[PDB]
RNA sequence: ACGGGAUAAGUGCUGAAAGCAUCUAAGCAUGAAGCCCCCCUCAAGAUGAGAUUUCCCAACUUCGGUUAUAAGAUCCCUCAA
RNA sequence: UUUGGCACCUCGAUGUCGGCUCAUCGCAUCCUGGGGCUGUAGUCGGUCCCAAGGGUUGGGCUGUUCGCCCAUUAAAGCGGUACGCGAGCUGGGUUCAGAACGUCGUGAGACAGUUCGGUCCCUAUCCGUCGUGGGCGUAGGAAAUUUGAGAGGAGCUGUCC
RNA sequence: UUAAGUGGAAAAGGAUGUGGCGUUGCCCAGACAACUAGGAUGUUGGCUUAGAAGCAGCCAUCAUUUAAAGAGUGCGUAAU
């Protein structure tokens, strides 16, 4: 996981979603995994 | 609800027993009772369960699709049921039946014992592939995830528990 | 009952005669050691020649304390002085000749070489 | 389950298997009887009430607690029994296994049973912080005028007060304390005594409550 | 250093909004020395003052007030766990 | 929590630093616990997230706060509470009278740069705290046994097979 | 209007979570997902670079079996 106030997509597959009031990004690879905080 | 517009939901050889706040379904493998929702409404014309959403609100628009999918799942699992399959890739990693319960050996200092549940049937193919037949899609998925969580796939070699068609990115460490 | 700063005679032929103890090891806050326990120590008086030289920092095992030991049968054993033997960080001694008597509680700590080399074991 | 009462007699030692030495407390558990059976439908909780040491019957112009009073006599009359010094309740037992008037015999306990033992601590009186708590004493030389007092009790203007639980002097002594997981060594039915491994709280000829451990 | 529940991070199942996908919106699980309970002690001045068992009850007398007095305490005295 | 800026309370007095005794809070986590990612093969390690329950050593040279070192430890955390705590203790430091070195000054003397020496008061009224009693209350009076709304305590960790 | 107890503590920046106002384009000759059905070849042709034939890095980036595809969008890639 990669926590940071600035979440952005790195690759095209890396989409953006919300869960429990927090912004996250989901990619096939987990290195692009992020959440906002 | 584009899926709620496909809410014909014709049962083949199965009854559909509404009871107001909840609904029961009975077929070949009956007894599927669920307290679905009240904001939605239902109807049975002859052999078609049609669901309707009021007020065209956001919440109703979501709940329409959710309830329709749940109802279709319930009737389809009462009719045909569901089956979830997986396999143990490993060396010395072996599972087997114990009547109703399952037993597994993965190289711990103690084997693992899976206690079965209702409307659930395990099936060992060749002590390396396993199937779980049931009627509740959520239940079979839950149990499959539970058993695979015991020893998930290892990345460097692939040792662990994995589905029949799951991919595992293997790192050459 | 060996604490920091106690002085012990040495009961082997390693080269040291008198030794001062620096630390009782084990846990944090360990204050006192007794028979079978390991200490680190300094040699304050050495014999000419010998393997170990004055000013060296070494490890030792305690044998024959004065405030001796109780046993499960309710028996006790005591001695008239405090003594130690210097070891090779494998429960083996640096010398080859143990002097004086030795307690029987050394068998429980895997000091069989010292027990074998010793005279009367009590 | 399996509770009884007794008096502490003293400490001795005994020899076990392979010659091992065992310090032992001897407890006189004598003439225990059941006086009452409390229930959930009446009293709100299931328990038996046990009386241990017999005293004298009622007497006119009696001044001491050696002689029962009319209430105690009537209470010990329902059960066909005599009046008793000490009365205590047990909630850990099965209430149906006992009967009013029944005699609780020491042979309820057998060797190897792990037990809890309850009693009042001895008694010491007004004691300071060095003894009542484990406080360190100040220097006895180098110009010191601070030996056995307690140190500071608070900080400063911020919190211009003393908090509760500050560990000052006061009375130390008799408070009830249980010790857990002692075991029975043997039982002598002719003298009606139990031998407990270890030591129990309280002075000699003092009441102790023995019962079975949970763990 | 146990064990029960509910939870955090996190892993999930089912599943729409958005014919797909999605751990979440509705729902079902798991999940920590942390929270609550379990363990020990104090505790009805808990003015909300609780409950059980047993004992006692006036001769007048609105048995109020009375001398009485009962159950029960105390004064006093010998003592200490 | 620093060095400062301002000069709002206190100059008919608000005790200065270290150390001892005694604690209490926060988390921006030293150990233990749970997890994600890894340029994580295992052993490990690095980074990030959750988390404050408990625990968090003894000595040498230091006035020393600070710092270096010796041996341990699962770890030797960072801070606040009048840089916590002198009507609880020392008084090593600084600074008062004495004296001396160096420097400066015509000099009396100064530096704050060094050095030896150099008096630490108080019978607790109120709040507060630790214990321990008397009075009254609780729809009759008493002896005994109790429930438990609440409150406090406890909570650590290692090596070996 | 808001669904956070915001209300009842700030910022650079980051995101969808909803309302409003316009402009503009997408379509029964069926839009926007998603199924599968085609993935090319003379051709890496050339400098042909560790060979590389979507990839040391500069391309030369031409017809098109075809209702319809590129001297390969793109997964890639030791190269495939």
Domain boundaries, chain C: 1-122
Tokens of B77: 């699992």
Indicate if CB(A4) is under 7 A from strand F: no
For residues D109 and D4, the answer to whether their CB atoms sit within 8 Å is yes
Task: Using CA coordinates, name the residue in chain C closest to D19.
Answer: C73
As to burial, measured by CB atoms within 10 angstroms (0-12 exposed, 13-18 middle, 19+ buried), residue C77 is middle
- Is D136 annotated to bind a ligand? Reply is yes
Strand F reaches within 7 A of the D153 CB: yes
**Which other chains touch chain A, taking contact as 3+ CB pairs less than 8 Å apart?**
none
Q: Which residues of A are annotated as a binding site?
A: 11, 14, 27, 32
Q: Which residue on chain C is closest to D16 by alpha carbon?
A: C73
Which residues lie closer than 8 Å to B11 by C-beta, 6 or more apart?
B27, B47, B49, B75, B79
Return the H-helix or E-strand segment holding D73: helix D70-78
**Distance separating alpha carbons of residues A1 and D186, to the nearest angstrom:** 63
Q: How many CB atoms lie within 10 A of CB D160?
A: 8
Backbone angles phi, psi at D150, to 5 degrees: -80, 155
H or E element: which one contains D76? helix D70-78
- Classify residue C95 as exposed, middle or buried by CB count within 10 Å of its CB (0-12, 13-18, 19+): buried
Experimental method: cryo-EM
Domain range holding D106? Answer: 1-215
**C/D Cβ contact: 3+ pairs below 8 Å:** yes
Distances (CA, A) of C58 to B20, C3, C14, C44: 85, 16, 11, 12
* CA-wise closest residue to C106 among C45, C37, C19, C50: C37
> Using CA atoms, how far apart are residues C9 and C85, in angstroms rounded to an integer?
9
Experimental resolution (Å): 2.3
Rg of chain B's alpha carbons, rounded to an integer?
A: 20
Provide the pairing of β-strand B112-114 with B101-105: antiparallel
The strand pair at D176-188 and D193-197 is best described as antiparallel
Decide if C73 touches D, using CB distance below 8 A.
Answer: yes
CB-based contact (8 Å) between D134 and chain C? Answer: no
d(CA D209, CA C71): 32
Separation between Cα atoms, residue C25 and residue C66, nearest integer Å: 20
Kindly list the strands in the beta sheet with B101-105, ordered across the sheet, starting from the edge strand earlier in the chain.
B94-98, B101-105, B112-114
Q: Which residues pair with B113 in a beta bridge?
A: B103
Nucleotide nearest to C25 in CA–C1' terms: F72
Distances in Å between the alpha carbon of B39 and those of B10, C114, D171?
Answer: 22, 86, 69
Backbone phi and psi for residue B87, each to the nearest 5 degrees, phi listed first: -145, 155
Q: Give the helix ranges, DSSP H, for chain B.
A: 58-79, 137-148
Flag whether residue C72 sits within 8 Å of chain D, measured between CB atoms. Answer: yes
CA distance B104 to B20: 44
Are 3 or more Cβ–Cβ pairs between D and A shorter than 8 Å?
Answer: no
CA-nearest of C8, C5, C6, C3 to C79 is C8
Q: Which two tokens stand for residue A4?
A: 């940071």
Tally of domains within chain D: 1
Distance CA D11, CA C119 (A): 40
Q: Report which of D60, D38, D40 is spatially closest to residue D49, judged by C-alpha positions.
A: D38
Q: In the structure, how far is the CA atom of residue C28 from the C1' atom of nucleotide F75, in angstroms?
A: 10
3-state secondary structure of D135: coil
Contact D176, D93 (CB under 8 A): no
Our separate counts of H helices and E strands in chain D read: 2, 12
Q: Give the nucleotide nearest to B35 (CA→C1').
A: E27
Which CATH number is C1-122's, of 2.60.40.3080, 2.40.50.140, 2.40.150.20, 3.40.50.720? 2.40.150.20
């Amino acid at each position: 996981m990669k926590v940071r106030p600035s979440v952005k997509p790195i690759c095209e597959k890396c989409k953006v979603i919300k869960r429990k009031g927090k912004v996250m990004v989901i990619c096939e690879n987990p290195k692009h995994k992020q959440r906002q905080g | 609800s584009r899926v709620g517009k496909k809410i014909i939901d014709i049962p083949s050889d199965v009854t559909v027993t509404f009871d107001g706040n909840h609904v029961t379904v009975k077929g070949p493998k009956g007894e599927l009772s669920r307290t679905l929702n009240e904001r939605m409404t239902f109807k049975q014309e002859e052999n078609t369960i049609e669901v309707v959403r009021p007020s065209d609100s956001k919440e109703d628009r979501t709940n329409h699709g959710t309830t329709r999918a749940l109802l279709n799942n319930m009737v389809q699992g009462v009719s045909q049921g569901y089956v979830k399959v997986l396999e143990l890739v490993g060396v010395g990693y072996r599972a087997q039946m114990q009547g109703k319960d399952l037993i597994l050996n993965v190289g711990y200092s103690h084997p693992v014992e899976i206690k079965a549940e209702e409307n659930i049937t395990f099936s060992v193919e060749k002590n390396t592939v396993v199937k779980v037949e049931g009627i509740s899609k959520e239940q079979v998925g839950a149990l499959a995830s539970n058993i695979r969580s015991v020893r998930p796939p290892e990345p460097y070699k692939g040792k662990g528990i994995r589905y029949q068609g799951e991919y595992v990115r293997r790192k050459e460490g | 009952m060996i604490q920091q700063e106690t002085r012990l005679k040495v009961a082997d032929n390693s080269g040291a005669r008198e030794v001062l103890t620096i630390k009782v090891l084990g846990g944090s806050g360990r204050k006192t050691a007794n028979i079978g326990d390991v200490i680190v120590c300094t040699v304050k008086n050495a014999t000419p020649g010998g393997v170990v030289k004055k000013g060296d920092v070494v490890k030792a095992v305690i044998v024959r304390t004065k405030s001796g030991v109780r046993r499960n049968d309710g028996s006790y054993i005591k001695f008239d002085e405090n003594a130690c033997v210097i070891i090779r960080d494998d429960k083996g001694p640096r010398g080859t000749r143990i002097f004086g008597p030795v307690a029987r509680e050394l068998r429980e700590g895997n000091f069989m070489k010292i027990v074998s080399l010793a005279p009367e074991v009590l | 389950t399996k509770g009884i009462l007794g008096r502490k007699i003293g400490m001795t030692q005994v020899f076990g298997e392979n010659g091992e030495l065992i310090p032992v407390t001897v407890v006189e558990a004598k003439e225990n009887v059941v006086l009452q059976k409390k229930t959930v439908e009446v009293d709100g909780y299931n328990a038996i009430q046990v009386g241990f040491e017999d005293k004298k019957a009622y007497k006119k112009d009696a001044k001491s607690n050696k002689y029962a009073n009319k209430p105690a006599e009537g209470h010990a009359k329902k059960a066909d029994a005599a009046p008793k010094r000490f009365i205590r309740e047990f909630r850990n037992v099965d209430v149906d296994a006992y009967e009013v008037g029944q005699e609780v015999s020491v042979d309820t306990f057998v060797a190897g049973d792990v037990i809890d033992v309850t009693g009042v601590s001895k008694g010491k009186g007004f004691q300071g912080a060095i003894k009542r708590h484990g406080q360190s004493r100040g220097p006895m030389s180098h110009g010191s005028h601070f030996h056995r007092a307690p140190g500071s009790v608070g900080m400063a203007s911020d919190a211009s007060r003393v908090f509760k639980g500050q560990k000052m002097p006061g009375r130390m002594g008799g408070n009830t304390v249980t010790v857990q997981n002692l075991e029975v060594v043997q039982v002598d039915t002719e003298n009606k005594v139990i031998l407990v491994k270890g030591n129990v709280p309280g002075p000699k000829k003092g009441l102790v409550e023995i019962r079975t451990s949970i763990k």
